[PDB]
Amino acid sequence: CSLDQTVAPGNLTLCGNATLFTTFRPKARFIAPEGWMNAPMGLYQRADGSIHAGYQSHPKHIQWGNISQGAAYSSDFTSWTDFNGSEGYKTIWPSQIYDIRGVFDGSIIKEGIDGYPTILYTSTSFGPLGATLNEAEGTETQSLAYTTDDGASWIKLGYGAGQNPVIYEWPETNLTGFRDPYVFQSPRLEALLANTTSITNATGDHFATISGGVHGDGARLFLYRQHTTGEFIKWTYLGPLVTTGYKESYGEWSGNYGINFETAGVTRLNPAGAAWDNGSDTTAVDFVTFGTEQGRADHQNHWPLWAAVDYEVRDNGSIEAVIAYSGVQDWGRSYAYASFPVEGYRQVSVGWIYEDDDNVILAKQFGYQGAFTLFRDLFVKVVENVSPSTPGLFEQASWSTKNSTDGMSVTVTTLGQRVVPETLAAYKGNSTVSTLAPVMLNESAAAYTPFSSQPTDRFYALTGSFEFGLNTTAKAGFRVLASEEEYTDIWFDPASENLTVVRTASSLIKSFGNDTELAKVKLYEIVGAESKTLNLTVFVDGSVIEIYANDEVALSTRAYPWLANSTGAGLLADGTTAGDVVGVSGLELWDGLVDAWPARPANTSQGLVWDGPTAAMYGLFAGY
Amino acid sequence: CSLDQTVAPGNLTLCGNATLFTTFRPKARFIAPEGWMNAPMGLYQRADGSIHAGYQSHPKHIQWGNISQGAAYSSDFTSWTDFNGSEGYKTIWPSQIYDIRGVFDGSIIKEGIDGYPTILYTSTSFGPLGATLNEAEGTETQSLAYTTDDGASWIKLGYGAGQNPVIYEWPETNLTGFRDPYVFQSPRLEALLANTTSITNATGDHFATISGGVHGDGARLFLYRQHTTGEFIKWTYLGPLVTTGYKESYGEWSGNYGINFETAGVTRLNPAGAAWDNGSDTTAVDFVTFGTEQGRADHQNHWPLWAAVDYEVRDNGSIEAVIAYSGVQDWGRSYAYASFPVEGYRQVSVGWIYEDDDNVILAKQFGYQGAFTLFRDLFVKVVENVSPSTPGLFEQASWSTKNSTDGMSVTVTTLGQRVVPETLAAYKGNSTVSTLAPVMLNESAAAYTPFSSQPTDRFYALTGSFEFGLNTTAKAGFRVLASEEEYTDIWFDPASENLTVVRTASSLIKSFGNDTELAKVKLYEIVGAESKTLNLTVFVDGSVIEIYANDEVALSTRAYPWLANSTGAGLLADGTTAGDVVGVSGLELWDGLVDAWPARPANTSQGLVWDGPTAAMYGLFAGY
Numbered sequence A, B: 001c002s003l004d005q006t007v008a009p010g011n012l013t014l015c016g017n018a019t020l021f022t023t024f025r026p027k028a029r030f031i032a033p034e035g036w037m038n039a040p041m042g043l044y045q046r047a048d049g050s051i052h053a054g055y056q057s058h059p060k061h062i063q064w065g066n067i068s069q070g071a072a073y074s075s076d077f078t079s080w081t082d083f084n085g086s087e088g089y090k091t092i093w094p095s096q097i098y099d100i101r102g103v104f105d106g107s108i109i110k111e112g113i114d115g116y117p118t119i120l121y122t123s124t125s126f127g128p129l130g131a132t133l134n135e136a137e138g139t140e141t142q143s144l145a146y147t148t149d150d151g152a153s154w155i156k157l158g159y160g161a162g163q164n165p166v167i168y169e170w171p172e173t174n175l176t177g178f179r180d181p182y183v184f185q186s187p188r189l190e191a192l193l194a195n196t197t198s199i200t201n202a203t204g205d206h207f208a209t210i211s212g213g214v215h216g217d218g219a220r221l222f223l224y225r226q227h228t229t230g231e232f233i234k235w236t237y238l239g240p241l242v243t244t245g246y247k248e249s250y251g252e253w254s255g256n257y258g259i260n261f262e263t264a265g266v267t268r269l270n271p272a273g274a275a276w277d278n279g280s281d282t283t284a285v286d287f288v289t290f291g292t293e294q295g296r297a298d299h300q301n302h303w304p305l306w307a308a309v310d311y312e313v314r315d316n317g318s319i320e321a322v323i324a325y326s327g328v329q330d331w332g333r334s335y336a337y338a339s340f341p342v343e344g345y346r347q348v349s350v351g352w353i354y355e356d357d358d359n360v361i362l363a364k365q366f367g368y369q370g371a372f373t374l375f376r377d378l379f380v381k382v383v384e385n386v387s388p389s390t391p392g393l394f395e396q397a398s399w400s401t402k403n404s405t406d407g408m409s410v411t412v413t414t415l416g417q418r419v420v421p422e423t424l425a426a427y428k429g430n431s432t433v434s435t436l437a438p439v440m441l442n443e444s445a446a447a448y449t450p451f452s453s454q455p456t457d458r459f460y461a462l463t464g465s466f467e468f469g470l471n472t473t474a475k476a477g478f479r480v481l482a483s484e485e486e487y488t489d490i491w492f493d494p495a496s497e498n499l500t501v502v503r504t505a506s507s508l509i510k511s512f513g514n515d516t517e518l519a520k521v522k523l524y525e526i527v528g529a530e531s532k533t534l535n536l537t538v539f540v541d542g543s544v545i546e547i548y549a550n551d552e553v554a555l556s557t558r559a560y561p562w563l564a565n566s567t568g569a570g571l572l573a574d575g576t577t578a579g580d581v582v583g584v585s586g587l588e589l590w591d592g593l594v595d596a597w598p599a600r601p602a603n604t605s606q607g608l609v610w611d612g613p614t615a616a617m618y619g620l621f622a623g624y
């Protein structure tokens, strides 16, 4: 095994465990110290204002198993510190018959058992588990634990009658899944249900959704309500909140609803951020965010979606969330988005970016798998004075339209997402910032034009505003992680409305994924404008490429170029002419970003281990 | 619920949990503080000379589940003290994927991991488990833990390759069971295998048997040898040590070998006790003790057996233990005998006495189930100068015969069992002892003759020597726990060779078992004697009746009389006449015995709990 990145890569499968630990590794984002990670979990803002983030974790392995909560904290979403206890950076792990198969995703009751922060999580035990298997009741249950030391440790309730697990009965038969409890307070839902509380007797101030579905009949998000305020054992099933059809799709802008939901959450937003009104704020919109399974041919059969919903009260004292419009939270290799409230009327969302090594060819050589996305403020994006001639505007696919009284303009409403400002400020302030001159892309434009200042490593951010003619057929964008032989091309093609990431040349290492990523982006044309603009922000962080368009569209993906000099970046142009010109302005390079884990050394591998021959006997975990 | 024991019992099923805690409870023997117990485990003499005893334990329940090691210690086998740690009196419990279904029976390596006492135990996980089910590999494995604090706590080896579990591969397919590892040193087996160690490479000084069998083809005791001295991970399967047939019986004196072995151990004894020679002691005999399943119509389908064996070395470097003769360790409601070495060349054996409430009618009202037997010294019983006219002597069923050179006398050899002298001394010394006058049972003998001194409670011992004519048809014995309306009759009938416990009147409470217990007892007639003698010792301890005959035959059973005055005792006589007389001598009553748990209050119940609806979902434990 040669690690010479000035020549072509050899057979890297001969390399030892964790020999490629630093080669492709993100430095500026949330990631476990080593080993396997997946979904964020247990997210909450602590009493001191800091952020506690948990994650599905399997240390010293590069496949899922014995799944536990790893945890860390930060005062600014950006610079983090690991917890360190008797189980290293783990704070919850399988330990009881009810959760021995895995401590799955869970969410936080901030004032829970004895007033302490409390996690409601999916406790798993033995048996077939999965949307495509024949799961039985008991395999997935929901259990409580609380912390008396701000997340350094958690104490589970005892096993038994009237204790853990607290939710175990399936609300309907033949479930495809029954997990990922999302606990939330909702003045909105309380106001809606207030006239029906005699029917159910459920009067608590916390609601919980559980994600699942029904075999052959589509996904379900099940709604429970805490039976009595201040008491956390009894949760009353109200009814299904969201019901979708077997592999139903709302269309090209909305992914596919699959067969089973996962990691679903419920929030309420207005243009500024989180909305905690009872329905009285006419600018507020109710949203559900959710993953779906088996409605996608690639990306691990997983769509991370969202929907705006209008709540209706059923006669039995339950809530139907009727989907008004439906979109995609991220179009790339990410999933398992969790959102949580943050002081100052914010709802912040974060997901998991998986690797692009689905055949597990170099995972051992990495010595880790997975990272988080960046943390994102959610809000209602409102675009005023939209031209009615915007192509496809009245499809109202992942947005709503409201006509002006005179019919000459439209107000567009959709889900907004933007990187939390703490991270943008820290990134910029710690980087070498190059403010670049604007560039007209015309007949003289090369296919690729390097920026006048270049990155120094694989940790940088780009921004640019691309102004297109209303009838353009030109394409433009950014090339990143680029040398002569390796590069990743991010294109927008306004004629097709497609944002693509072409990865056919991303790496000389052929075992990594190279499929083209694709997002739809609607450029809402403004009344009186003779052009349409794409604001593109790109974060390059080891192997992560995370793209944001117009504080709306997100696409996370992976690139693993071998060569040390595959770090360059610049502008892409295709079919730009004297007549079809793309004006690029607001161009800026931030080189370096932030060291997100300042206390960690460069190599935090502790080696990898094998569970031995019993892993196959038990059949629960791959074993490595 | 009335607890008036001066009148007939009401409907005791209306009584609350643990309301009958003290009513029938042993006071003079090893028993858990409360709840469910079964098999002894983890028995060893500690460095300070005290005895550590573990037991299969499920606190706050009255059926088996979450099975754990409860533990206590004693300097004299007789007066005990509970361990008290973070899990009460438990010291090992289910905690890992490999043992989450139960910490089953295990045995002690005295100089194990890092020189510390080390337990090798059956770690169980999910799946069908049982001799009559379709068990699969992995469900029962064998794991290690060690103690740095003389049994107050145990540290398990880690889960994984080269660590726990240490034995997981089934030595043959389609096993009925794979559990109860018995670790032992054996100069005998080492000497026998010394010429074959090149074949197997196994040269360690510890052996281990694992108890099981093969579906449709009888029981098996599998022999392993520690691969390398001072190393405890690698154990090499040599071959089957004991192989018996599907429900094979050696006859009337030997129970039935069933379909599966449990709790089997290997020892070597001579007339004084334990023998640690290499084969050079011609007075020493190799023994296996073992439980069998499904070869019995009652007594929970369980026979606690033993066999004298002659070892043969196989060509592949393994040992066949060929059964020479075969007997019964206890004929009553006991099982799961474990033996362990004790200083002064002793091997001490102890088992578990189950209740006689198999339909679980009053178990909750008890608030506990189970006790130990008394601790028993094992030795080779040798009877010299036996008359060749002893009926049935040359059947050599559970004994051996060696003729004198002249053929006029026989030496009989069998397994001897006697209560450890520490217990007999402590019992007698703490009791009110009444030495009773000898009694001739003749034509004037009543059916029942109370002793001249009477017990004061349900805690006493009796002894007597019953001298019978060689052609007697009379029966004699002891009645115990007796009032006019309730009593338990212990009869010996030399003509049939049957020792019986008749329990048709043991209790007014009709839900307890009332079947007649039966043991065979061979009165070896001595050359020149005109009579034959039965030495009977009986311990009455709450509901336990534990009978010893001639330091050979043991029979443990249960009686639960309701009335407070059902405590009396005396002599039984049937068919005694002027010509057929039974001479009873050496009669002694010990009233009171010892308070075996001096630190415990009278009621150590902590209440009972229910596991809730998930118990049935998981299907592993009854849940109460």
Ligand SMILES: *[C@@H]1O[C@H](CO)[C@@H](O[C@@H]2O[C@H](CO)[C@@H](O[C@@H]3O[C@H](CO[C@H]4O[C@H](CO[C@H]5O[C@H](CO)[C@@H](O)[C@H](O)[C@@H]5O[C@H]5O[C@H](CO)[C@@H](O)[C@H](O)[C@@H]5O)[C@@H](O)[C@H](O[C@H]5O[C@H](CO)[C@@H](O)[C@H](O)[C@@H]5O)[C@@H]4O)[C@@H](O)[C@H](O[C@H]4O[C@H](CO)[C@@H](O)[C@H](O)[C@@H]4O[C@H]4O[C@H](CO)[C@@H](O)[C@H](O)[C@@H]4O[C@H]4O[C@H](CO)[C@@H](O)[C@H](O)[C@@H]4O)[C@@H]3O)[C@H](O)[C@H]2NC(C)=O)[C@H](O)[C@H]1NC(C)=O
Residues within 6 Å of the ligand: A092, A093, A095, A096, A097, A113, A114, A154, A155, A156, A157, A158, A159, B066, B068, B085, B086, B087, B090, B093, B094, B095
């Ligand atoms: C199979 O068997 C298994 C083993 O038995 C069994 O698992 C065990 O289950 C039991 C029962 O559920 C669990 O017991 C609970 O423990 C909770 C605390 O748990 C934390 O702490 C313990 C013990 O802590 C120590 O010991 C360890 C080990 O040495 C040390 O590491 C610690 O430093 C600490 O040591 C100190 O203390 C020791 C003595 O205990 C000393 O020896 C030592 O020197 C030190 O000084 C840990 O072991 C736990 O770890 C395990 O669990 C965590 C997850 O939780 C894992 O991550 C980890 O790996 C371990 O597996 C853990 O850290 C107790 O809080 C709980 O006690 C209460 O609940 C019951 C009701 O169920 C009440 O009876 C009791 O009164 C307590 O409730 C009161 O208090 C709470 C708040 O504290 C209130 O909310 C509540 O309302 C109530 O209040 C009442 O009283 C108040 C009085 O002030 C009053 O104010 C109120 O008004 C009110 O009236 C319970 O004891 C046990 O932890 C499990 N153990 C393990 C190893 O799993 C398993 O379930 C079985 N399975 C099946 C299928 O049956």
Ligand SMILES: *[C@@H]1O[C@H](CO)[C@@H](O[C@@H]2O[C@H](CO)[C@@H](O[C@@H]3O[C@H](CO[C@H]4O[C@H](CO[C@H]5O[C@H](CO)[C@@H](O)[C@H](O)[C@@H]5O[C@H]5O[C@H](CO)[C@@H](O)[C@H](O)[C@@H]5O)[C@@H](O)[C@H](O[C@H]5O[C@H](CO)[C@@H](O)[C@H](O)[C@@H]5O)[C@@H]4O)[C@@H](O)[C@H](O[C@H]4O[C@H](CO)[C@@H](O)[C@H](O)[C@@H]4O[C@H]4O[C@H](CO)[C@@H](O)[C@H](O)[C@@H]4O[C@H]4O[C@H](CO)[C@@H](O)[C@H](O)[C@@H]4O)[C@@H]3O)[C@H](O)[C@H]2NC(C)=O)[C@H](O)[C@H]1NC(C)=O
Residues within 6 Å of the ligand: A066, A068, A085, A086, A087, A090, A093, A094, A095, B092, B093, B095, B096, B097, B113, B114, B154, B155, B156, B157, B158, B159
């Ligand atoms: C799913 O995830 C699960 C959770 O991660 C996982 O279970 C965990 O597995 C790991 C890995 O196997 C276990 O880790 C081992 O722990 C052993 C010790 O275990 C005992 O102690 C721990 C920790 O003790 C403390 O913390 C608790 C909780 O707060 C307190 O109660 C205690 O008081 C004590 O607290 C003090 O210390 C804390 C810091 O640790 C402080 O925070 C605190 O303030 C106090 O000061 C307990 O948690 C354990 O309890 C659990 O397990 C018991 C059964 O064992 C249960 O009954 C109980 O309910 C709990 O479940 C337990 O009591 C370590 O000994 C072991 O360390 C060694 O092994 C590895 C190799 O595997 C080596 O890397 C390492 O060096 C150690 O080996 C050396 O040392 C030994 C002798 O000590 C030698 O034999 C050996 O050769 C080697 O020697 C070498 O170094 C020497 C240096 O001196 C040198 O001399 C030699 O020459 C040689 O070179 C290991 O860390 C962990 O316990 C499990 N935890 C739990 C909760 O289960 C599970 O497996 C996963 N499942 C799957 C399917 O993957």
Ligand SMILES: *[C@@H]1O[C@H](CO)[C@@H](O[C@@H]2O[C@H](CO)[C@@H](O[C@@H]3O[C@H](CO[C@H]4O[C@H](CO)[C@@H](O)[C@H](O[C@H]5O[C@H](CO)[C@@H](O)[C@H](O)[C@@H]5O)[C@@H]4O)[C@@H](O)[C@H](O[C@H]4O[C@H](CO)[C@@H](O)[C@H](O)[C@@H]4O)[C@@H]3O)[C@H](O)[C@H]2NC(C)=O)[C@H](O)[C@H]1NC(C)=O
Residues within 6 Å of the ligand: A161, A162, A163, B017, B364, B607, B608, B609, B610, B612, B613, B624
């Ligand atoms: C005495 O000790 C027992 C432990 O043995 C303590 O707990 C009780 O255990 C028994 C089992 O021995 C349980 O009986 C079973 O009950 C279920 C149905 O339970 C439901 O109905 C109950 C009656 O109103 C109710 O109390 C239960 O509520 C508890 O449990 C729920 C979880 O479901 C929890 O949320 C609550 O907070 C309570 O803790 C519950 O709603 C029944 O299905 C079982 O039936 C089987 O067995 C019977 C008898 O063999 C048979 O007739 C059936 O056909 C079936 O096979 C079984 O009856 C009892 O529920 C437990 N009670 C509890 C936990 O409160 C008991 O508390 C101790 N008493 C005291 C005073 O300490």
Ligand SMILES: *[C@@H]1O[C@H](CO)[C@@H](O[C@@H]2O[C@H](CO)[C@@H](O[C@@H]3O[C@H](CO[C@H]4O[C@H](CO)[C@@H](O)[C@H](O[C@H]5O[C@H](CO)[C@@H](O)[C@H](O)[C@@H]5O)[C@@H]4O)[C@@H](O)[C@H](O[C@H]4O[C@H](CO)[C@@H](O)[C@H](O)[C@@H]4O)[C@@H]3O)[C@H](O)[C@H]2NC(C)=O)[C@H](O)[C@H]1NC(C)=O
Residues within 6 Å of the ligand: A017, A364, A607, A608, A609, A610, A612, A613, A624, B161, B162, B163
């Ligand atoms: C690097 O990290 C790995 C963890 O990922 C460390 O452990 C090794 O993990 C791999 C899995 O990633 C294991 O590979 C499997 O091995 C088994 C067969 O194992 C046997 O043969 C080995 C080779 O001689 C031997 O080392 C093993 O000994 C260990 O385990 C036994 C318990 O069985 C234990 O008693 C010993 O003490 C050792 O700990 C063992 O005898 C094989 O069956 C598996 O095959 C599957 O997968 C492959 C590849 O996909 C495929 O070809 C097959 O068809 C099948 O699907 C698999 O290869 C490896 O055994 C682990 N090695 C160990 C534990 O030593 C590894 O140690 C780390 N290296 C370093 C230097 O730290």
Ligand SMILES: OC[C@H]1O[C@H](OC[C@H]2O[C@H](O[C@]3(CO)O[C@H](CO)[C@@H](O)[C@@H]3O)[C@H](O)[C@@H](O)[C@@H]2O)[C@H](O)[C@@H](O)[C@H]1O
Residues within 6 Å of the ligand: A038, A039, A056, A064, A067, A104, A105, A122, A128, A129, A130, A131, A179, A180, A262, A263, A293, A335, A336, A620
């Ligand atoms: O069939 C068993 C299954 O086990 C493992 O997968 C478990 C579960 O993981 C994922 O679910 C989410 C979201 O991705 O991740 C956590 C668990 O870490 C859940 O709380 C959450 O819903 C998958 O999306 C599920 O499909 C999957 O069942 C293992 O990884 C699988 O390979 C498989 O063996």
Ligand SMILES: OC[C@H]1O[C@H](OC[C@H]2O[C@H](O[C@]3(CO)O[C@H](CO)[C@@H](O)[C@@H]3O)[C@H](O)[C@@H](O)[C@@H]2O)[C@H](O)[C@@H](O)[C@H]1O
Residues within 6 Å of the ligand: B038, B039, B056, B064, B067, B104, B105, B122, B128, B129, B130, B131, B179, B180, B262, B263, B293, B335, B336, B620
């Ligand atoms: O089928 C599962 C089975 O689980 C429980 O029984 C387990 C096991 O217990 C007994 O085995 C012994 C000896 O009696 O006891 C310990 C376990 O505590 C073992 O180490 C030891 O061999 C029985 O003899 C076995 O037949 C039995 O499989 C439960 O009690 C059963 O009812 C049943 O549900």
Ligand SMILES: *[C@@H]1O[C@H](CO)[C@@H](O)[C@H](O)[C@H]1NC(C)=O
Residues within 6 Å of the ligand: A005, A006, A007, A483, A484, A485, A563, A565
């Ligand atoms: C980048 O590195 C490769 C291999 O060392 C080399 O061929 C190339 O010329 C280098 N410089 C570039 C692309 O600017």
Ligand SMILES: *[C@@H]1O[C@H](CO)[C@@H](O)[C@H](O)[C@H]1NC(C)=O
Residues within 6 Å of the ligand: A011, A013, A014
């Ligand atoms: C790469 O090495 C592996 C062994 O790790 C080998 O099986 C494979 O054929 C090699 N690939 C080549 C030489 O292209």
Ligand SMILES: *[C@@H]1O[C@H](CO)[C@@H](O)[C@H](O)[C@H]1NC(C)=O
Residues within 6 Å of the ligand: A237, A238, A239, A240, A314, A316, A318
């Ligand atoms: C309430 O009604 C809805 C609509 O039919 C149903 O799906 C849900 O299960 C009902 N809630 C119950 C039975 O608690």
Ligand SMILES: *[C@@H]1O[C@H](CO)[C@@H](O)[C@H](O)[C@H]1NC(C)=O
Residues within 6 Å of the ligand: A388, A403, A407, A408
């Ligand atoms: C919205 O405006 C467009 C263009 O003016 C028009 O076609 C459509 O009918 C309007 N919708 C409503 C509800 O007035």
Ligand SMILES: *[C@@H]1O[C@H](CO)[C@@H](O)[C@H](O)[C@H]1NC(C)=O
Residues within 6 Å of the ligand: A076, A078, A079, A425, A426, A427, A428, A429, A430, A594
């Ligand atoms: C650099 O990053 C840290 C960590 O997030 C942040 O607190 C600090 O303000 C940044 N430095 C600047 C903006 O100069």
Ligand SMILES: *[C@@H]1O[C@H](CO)[C@@H](O)[C@H](O)[C@H]1NC(C)=O
Residues within 6 Å of the ligand: A389, A390, A391, A470, A471, A525
């Ligand atoms: C030019 O773009 C406008 C929308 O901006 C569209 O309505 C019109 O049809 C386009 N012209 C073509 C296709 O010739």
Ligand SMILES: *[C@@H]1O[C@H](CO)[C@@H](O)[C@H](O)[C@H]1NC(C)=O
Residues within 6 Å of the ligand: A252, A493, A496, A497, A498, A518, A520
């Ligand atoms: C744009 O994307 C859609 C997928 O939504 C695809 O069907 C279409 O072919 C794409 N067109 C171009 C020109 O990229």
Ligand SMILES: *[C@@H]1O[C@H](CO)[C@@H](O)[C@H](O)[C@H]1NC(C)=O
Residues within 6 Å of the ligand: B005, B006, B007, B483, B484, B485, B563, B565
């Ligand atoms: C024993 O008690 C019962 C019920 O109180 C009574 O009938 C009997 O006469 C008492 N005395 C005996 C049997 O000596």
Ligand SMILES: *[C@@H]1O[C@H](CO)[C@@H](O)[C@H](O)[C@H]1NC(C)=O
Residues within 6 Å of the ligand: B011, B013, B014
């Ligand atoms: C005893 O009480 C139980 C209830 O615990 C009842 O079902 C049974 O019929 C009663 N037996 C009688 C009255 O003989």
Ligand SMILES: *[C@@H]1O[C@H](CO)[C@@H](O)[C@H](O)[C@H]1NC(C)=O
Residues within 6 Å of the ligand: B237, B238, B239, B240, B314, B316, B318
């Ligand atoms: C040794 O031979 C015996 C007798 O055939 C056999 O039962 C046992 O499995 C053999 N040992 C092995 C294969 O290790």
